[PDB]
Design a protein around this ligand. Structure first.
Ligand code: C5P
Length: 299
């Protein structure tokens, strides 16, 4: 489930966002969408904590001990919510100015970034062969995501600037979260709540500083459609399910498992629906398989 959700959210997210940024007459403030995403994720996470603790009194006691009585954990997790506030805003900026396939292949540089961050920040080591597999994975997903190519003004350079910022943000903020997540036995859903609390503040502050003037003229939810809420819904689910993947595996295995899932789900749709694929995909898929194999060997 957690990988099938992740992919059908991976596929639909960048396409739906790209669409909402290029077809609109009345155009929404994307800083707001990023803020609303943190709110929704906070709310699902609060829901999930009540299920896990399994009681109103245990739920309340957990928020007391782990939010109200853990200010240093909030302080720490404000850093990656600051970085994710930039990352997530950069994604919206990139897809406003670039083709979705051109966004997809470029954003895959997060994979080497994330590996280097893991090695540096989590006190971990990757063999010569494990490093080889990471670059092969990156080259494989590059080929998997490659495809042919608005009535709005566009700035490809600005689009590529934003992907460079988001790639750096992805490696750093993801690995910072994992470090904090795996440093104690504290619940995943506490960590998410601790984080999304600051996320709501930082994201809302960014909205005010970027688009505050024009929002006072036009309104917070100006330009919002059924498709803008779909993008927010997908970002929220993808965000939460990214955190679960980090809990049960890690930020490096997130790349291999996401790559594997896109390959297998596309292969499933070839056989079930007669979906047509490229030669690039077929080769990309084979390198994703080999990379997973190589990565998983004894050192
Ligand atoms: N604990 C976490 C970790 C990541 N996330 C979200 O997951 C996404 C991470 O995407 P990448 O894997 O591309 O860095 C971001 O949208 C980030 O806000 C989250 O919502 N909660």
């Amino acid at each position: 489930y957690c990988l099938t959700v992740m992919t059908l959210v991976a596929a639909a997210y960048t396409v739906a966002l790209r669409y909402t940024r290029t077809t609109a007459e009345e155009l929404y403030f994307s800083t707001t969408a990023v803020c609303i995403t943190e709110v929704i994720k906070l709310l699902i996470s609060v829901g999930l904590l009540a299920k896990e603790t399994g009681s109103l009194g245990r739920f309340k006691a957990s928020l007391s001990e782990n939010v109200l009585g853990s200010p240093k954990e909030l302080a720490k997790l404000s850093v990656p919510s600051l970085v994710y506030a930039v990352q997530n805003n950069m994604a919206f900026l990139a897809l406003s100015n670039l083709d979705a396939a051109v966004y997809q292949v470029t954003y895959q540089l997060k994979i080497p970034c994330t590996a280097l961050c893991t090695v540096l920040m989590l006190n971990r080591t990757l063999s010569k062969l494990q490093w080889i597999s990471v670059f092969m994975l990156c080259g494989g997903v590059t080929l998997v995501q490659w495809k042919p190519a608005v009535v709005v003004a566009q700035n490809p350079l600005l689009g590529f600037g934003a992907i460079a910022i988001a790639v750096l943000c992805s490696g750093f903020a993801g690995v910072y979260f994992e470090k904090v997540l795996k440093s104690s036995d504290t619940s995943l859903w506490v960590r998410n709540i601790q984080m999304y609390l600051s996320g709501i503040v930082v994201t809302l502050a960014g909205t005010y500083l970027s688009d505050g003037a024009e929002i006072q003229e036009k309104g917070f939810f100006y330009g919002y459609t059924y498709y803008v809420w779909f993008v927010i819904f997908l970002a929220s689910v993808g965000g939460l399910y990214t955190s679960v993947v980090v809990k049960y595996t890690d930020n490096i295995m997130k790349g291999f498992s996401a790559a594997a899932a896109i390959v297998l789900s596309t292969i499933a749709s070839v056989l079930l629906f007669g979906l047509q694929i490229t030669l690039s995909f077929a080769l990309g898929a084979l390198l994703v398989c080999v990379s997973i194999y190589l990565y998983g060997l004894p050192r």
